[PDB]
Curated annotation (Swiss-Prot), chains A, B:
Cross-link (Glycyl lysine isopeptide (Lys-Gly) (interchain with G-Cter in ubiquitin)): 312
Family: Belongs to the ribonucleoside diphosphate reductase large chain family.
Protein name: Ribonucleoside-diphosphate reductase large chain 1
GO MF annotations, alphabetized: ATP binding; identical protein binding; nucleotide binding; ribonucleoside-diphosphate reductase activity, thioredoxin disulfide as acceptor
Chain's gene name: RNR1
Organism listed in the record: Saccharomyces cerevisiae (strain ATCC 204508 / S288c) (Baker's yeast)
Keywords assigned by UniProt, alphabetized: Allosteric enzyme, ATP-binding, Cytoplasm, Deoxyribonucleotide synthesis, Disulfide bond, Isopeptide bond, Nucleotide-binding, Oxidoreductase, Phosphoprotein, Ubl conjugation
Keyword rRNA-binding attributed: no
Lineage: Eukaryota, Fungi, Dikarya, Ascomycota, Saccharomycotina
Part of the whole protein covered: 76 to 746 of 888
Length: 664, 664
């Protein structure tokens, strides 16, 4: 509350003032236990700072360090700001400026403009960027989609090294394994039989612990993807279970499903489902939709697998999701039908947070780089006070900058494995998202489930896409289209909402944009992929993501600001009020004396029907180039209740059906 | 007892008679679950059999299948003989003949001579050979000494793949890790710190389970080597412990010590010992003896490590050996001082059974191929009955054949990893050994601890070395010396006993041999390395190794044959006799009515002082080109009792001080 004006002002006492001087300390730094030079800025950047020392130190408006809250800033403090001898050397306005340089190089113009927006909290970059930008070998990329190289030991161990090598800097991982022969399959080279998928998981799990993000930082985090027609499926969904045969689990990895529609059909038609080893049914994961059912269906009839009740596996699945909140569900066909990267071949997985959908292959590791726009920062008191409005014009302007920013990162990024440099330089996927969605709605006195909010959600995401395409367009005008652009849905003028079959909302001239794209190309294969934003929404102080509030009272106990103020204005904020939020989860519902309109504005995500949540997710998805991390929350979860969340969303044509499942 | 004349004769009913016909069944074989051709003979051999069908089927004397005992043969049955549909297709005389071809090619002369000796039980080959010889991709090699490629993730994971790739056919492994930076050391690339050696062990342990020798056969088996000056040493010795912090053990690997003399000195002088990370003290394992102490000593004084009491670590060690029977102790200097491969660089480890000492490096994986001569088979009733003798003339003749055999294997072997083909083709190490040593002594009415037995042990091993060198010499006459011969102790005329500083015993003309070696070279870098022989001594029916009997009564309960007969001749074999062997471990000592000379002949290895055992080990070692697997057995093990076994043997200049430690 007050210890934010106080712990911020304390580090202002115990830290150097001039920027160029902080760079100097970092650049010159030497590990004392080893007498070894351990610089924390790169040559390229160090130089830049020096040759503009005056222009740069006089940019940094230091009164801007007071835009961060209590835990906003103590998060920047504990893990983000660069550290001399356990002592913090970087002020928050120093991390920003360094990030801006780390991104912009000799374009000190772009640098300064990027510095201003980050300091006035218009937007921010994902954690890898904030940590590493402007430093010796800058690894600014959050996520990696990796292919299992081949159904062999060589392939397996080659993929296992790669995962270590990636895990050792720090990037999540999405690995897919559709091709590993299942328990029992023959091996020609040793007249032997396979123990299947689980022991293989176990090795990876293991490397995931050993390679603790560059030694002593964070233990690795892997998402693994399968298609539910793989014969090891029952054991694969159970990987995070709490009970028995320890030798058969793998508690530090996340199972995700790559779900073909056929599967969903079978389940609702209460029919059969057939399980295969990839060696008996080759090719199932190198095609989708119709061509897939044609081929799946034939393999089937040919006696090639083991059939059970489609519904047996489904029950298995819901059982696991209820207990672990996993596996995730990403819809394979939905993904491939509506991806701008379809000319590349069949996309085989998503990432760790289920927002990225990008082509991956043995020699191509899909990479993506994220930033998030701060939705609340564009709200303004109207043109006659006593009333508020949203500035879509600025938002558009802003998304353009972040779009350009995310490009430079592609060029100035340091790549852990050659597969990822090959991948990223060819297709250039970028990933924008949002935060403060629930805050924006709140500020505007629009409940999350209203028709105004529903409308707002649509138009916010419209301008963000339209902008991120406009600017990807200008860049292709300057630097050429991405190399793999010829052939894409985009090159024909098919944009994201076109392939969902909808007219756009229309707040922006889509006809003109498409004309230019068709004409000159765009720089990026992809652009929009709203992410969890867990770490960075904390720092800016917004509710993460697009999810609504889980609670109006967090934990040290902090009550939702926007509500807090409302209560005291309505002269009802005493102690009885504080105490009916403490044990009762922070739900202002059914509460002795609180106006029905506040009750409508301050709903906990458990009080929003998951039918409404899905709808809005389905609405913004028309402008989402990739997918998005859709978490689901039920209180009293019956088997059927889950069953209609999955089916509803699938029938909505969602790419990501479910990320997590938070329960109870 | 009788069910060996009965279970052997039963498979004679349920198996094809003609050899060429069995080859045919194998060669043509098709896995029914996959409709895939799975031949069990190679093209090369299949052809050979066909084009000599008549000469070959009429070689096989089938009355020779009755030379195997009860569990001798049911061991050949359960795991050795090739199997059609879980049905056995190969007779024992078929496995032999196939092995002989698998080895000898178009030299059908050598083939037939090799077939005869194997069937009359003159000698045999190690398990990889018996299994694989003459089959599609013949992997005939028991052991692999592997180098940790480099102190990096790339290096670590590159070594981990290699180990999988090796483990997947089936060869033990000796890996050494002297160079991996220890807990806490700095990492430049991620401004981080190392969790050290244990988690690294844990990954390897893991790959060792996953890669179950070609899928569904045997779980992998790794020996790991360290020098006790490595800072993770206390945790490394404890790897097989039975108690706490599960996250800190690794129960499926074997710790072994590469022990520098300095360490032993410090311990007996009750002085200091200093622990280093290889990154603080680089080079300790790329030198030995004096140059090492010079360098170790300096690093020390320079403040580079952490000193404790030499004796602290020693106590740690004996504590672990008492409880687990591990780590093994191989003496580094002893090994390098007296190796014919010293011109190659510094040998850094032994194998899994502690008998191999061969040069290894990141790109060179040391390989060795074993066989074992059947010591009893050369005993003969003298030249006037009523008395026995040993035919050293035949033994010599025989060791020559096995020597030639072991060569062809080098050329016809299929190599799992390129490192091992490079290694083996350059240096050509071969490994002969023995079995039936305790049987030989018994047959001859010479107690294991006598002066006659002591003499016999010396001369047996003399002729075996002299022969294996003579024939390696003739081969260098035919095919050229091994490529790395120029420079060796051998090229100068320095033979194995010379570098122990002893005159040979003299039963064979050593002057003439050395003349030829100096003149023409020898084919092999090394030749003699007596092994555990566990699996194959079972089959031929001899007591394994050179170790004496552990028991006169095994388990179905079988009593030592040579004793059994003695008792019934001495008219004292009733039931009371049987019953004073059952619970009382099979020790005929201090027993109501059994002649003191039998008591002297039928000693259990626990009743032989380990001082005697060491002496004989020290005696034969002068003719052992490599080292040998020296197991130790104590009943009432005090700390000091162990301490003088280690020190005694070290001062004896033994290379392998201790393999296992069987206790209680
Ligand atoms: N659990 C276990 N799995 C194995 C082992 N060896 C191979 N595999 C599994 C993993 C791979 O997905 C599959 C194929 O391995 P490879 O391609 O190295 O087998 P190879 O080329 O000898 O035989 P193939 O012709 O592919 O059947 O076999 C083993 O020793 N243990
Ligand atoms: N536990 C753990 N150990 C690591 C990690 N990254 C590296 N290591 C250890 C294993 C290696 O023996 C040692 C060196 O690894 P590298 O050569 O790949 O480190 P790099 O080249 O970045 O730094 P260097 O210049 O060698 O300190 O660091 C990690 O994320 N976790
Ligand atoms: Mg294969
Ligand atoms: Mg390195």
């Amino acid at each position: 509350t007050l210890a934010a004006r106080i712990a911020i002002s304390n580090l202002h006492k115990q830290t150097t003032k001039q920027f160029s001087k902080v760079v100097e300390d970092l650049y010159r730094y030497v590990n004392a236990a080893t007498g070894k030079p351990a610089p924390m800025i790169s040559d390229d950047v160090y130089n830049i700072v020096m040759e503009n020392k005056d222009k740069l130190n006089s940019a940094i408006v230091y009164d801007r360090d007071f835009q961060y809250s209590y835990f906003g800033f103590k998060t920047l403090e504990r893990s983000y700001l660069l550290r001399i001898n356990g002592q913090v050397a970087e002020r928050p306005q120093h991390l920003i400026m360094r990030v801006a340089l780390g991104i912009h190089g000799r374009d000190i113009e772009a640098a300064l403009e990027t510095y201003n927006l980050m300091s006035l909290k218009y937007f921010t970059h994902a954690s890898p960027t904030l940590f590493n930008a402007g430093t010796p070998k800058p690894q600014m990329s959050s996520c990696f989609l990796v292919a299992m190289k081949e159904d062999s030991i060589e392939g397996i161990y080659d993929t296992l090294k790669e995962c270590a090598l990636i895990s050792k800097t720090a990037g999540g991982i999405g690995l897919h394994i559709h091709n590993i022969r299942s328990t029992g399959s023959y091996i020609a080279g040793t007249n032997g039989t396979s123990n299947g998928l689980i022991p293989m998981i176990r090795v990876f799990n293991n490397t995931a612990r050993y390679v603790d993000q560059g030694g002593n930082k964070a233990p690795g985090a892997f998402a693994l993807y399968l298609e539910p027609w793989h014969a090891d499926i029952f054991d694969f969904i159970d990987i995070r279970k709490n009970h028995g045969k320890e030798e058969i689990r793998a508690r530090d990895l996340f199972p995700a499903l790559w779900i073909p529609d056929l599967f969903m059909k079978r389940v609702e038609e209460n029919g059969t489902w057939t399980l295969f080893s990839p060696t008996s049914a080759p090719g199932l994961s190198d095609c989708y939709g119709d061509e897939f059912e044609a081929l799946y269906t034939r393999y089937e009839k040919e006696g090639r697998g083991k059939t059970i009740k489609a519904q047996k596996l489904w029950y298995s699945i819901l059982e696991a999701q209820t207990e672990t909140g996993t596996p995730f569900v990403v819809y394979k066909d939905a993904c491939n039908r509506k991806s701008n990267q379809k000319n590349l071949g069949v996309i085989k997985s998503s990432n760790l947070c289920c927002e990225i959908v990008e082509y991956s292959a043995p020699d191509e590791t899909a990479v993506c780089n994220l930033a998030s726009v701060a939705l609340p920062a564009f709200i303004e008191t109207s043109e006659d006070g006593k009333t508020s409005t949203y500035n879509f014009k600025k938002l558009h302007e802003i998304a353009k900058v972040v779009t350009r920013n995310l490009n430079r990162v592609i060029d100035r990024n340091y790549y852990p494995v050659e597969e990822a440099r090959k991948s990223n330089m060819r297709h250039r996927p970028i990933a924008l998202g949002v935060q403060g969605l629930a805050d924006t709605f709140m500020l505007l006195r629009l409940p999350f489930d209203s028709e105004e909010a529903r409308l707002l959600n649509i138009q916010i995401f419209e301008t963000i896409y339209h902008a991120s395409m406009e600017a990807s367009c200008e860049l292709a005008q300057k630097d050429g289209p991405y190399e793999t652009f010829q052939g894409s849905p985009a090159s024909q003028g098919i944009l994201q909402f076109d392939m969902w079959d909808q007219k756009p909302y229309g707040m922006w001239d889509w006809d003109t944009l498409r004309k230019d794209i068709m004409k000159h190309g765009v720089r990026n294969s992809l652009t929009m992929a709203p992410m969890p934003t867990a770490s960075t929404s904390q720092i800016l102080g917004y509710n993460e993501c697009f999810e609504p509030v889980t609670s109006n009272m967090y934990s040290f106990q902090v009550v939702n600001p926007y509500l807090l103020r409302d209560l005291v204005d309505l002269g009802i904020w005493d102690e009885g009020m504080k105490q009916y939020l403490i044990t009762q989860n922070g739900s202002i519902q059914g509460l002795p004396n609180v106006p029905q309109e506040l009750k409508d504005l301050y709903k906990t995500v458990w009080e929003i029907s998951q039918k409404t949540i899905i709808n809005m997710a389905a609405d913004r998805s028309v402008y989402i180039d990739q997918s998005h991390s859709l978490n689901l929350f039920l209180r009293a979860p019956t088997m059927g209740k889950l069953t209609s969340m999955h089916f509803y969303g699938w029938k909505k044509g969602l790419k990501t059906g479910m990320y997590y499942l938070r329960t109870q």
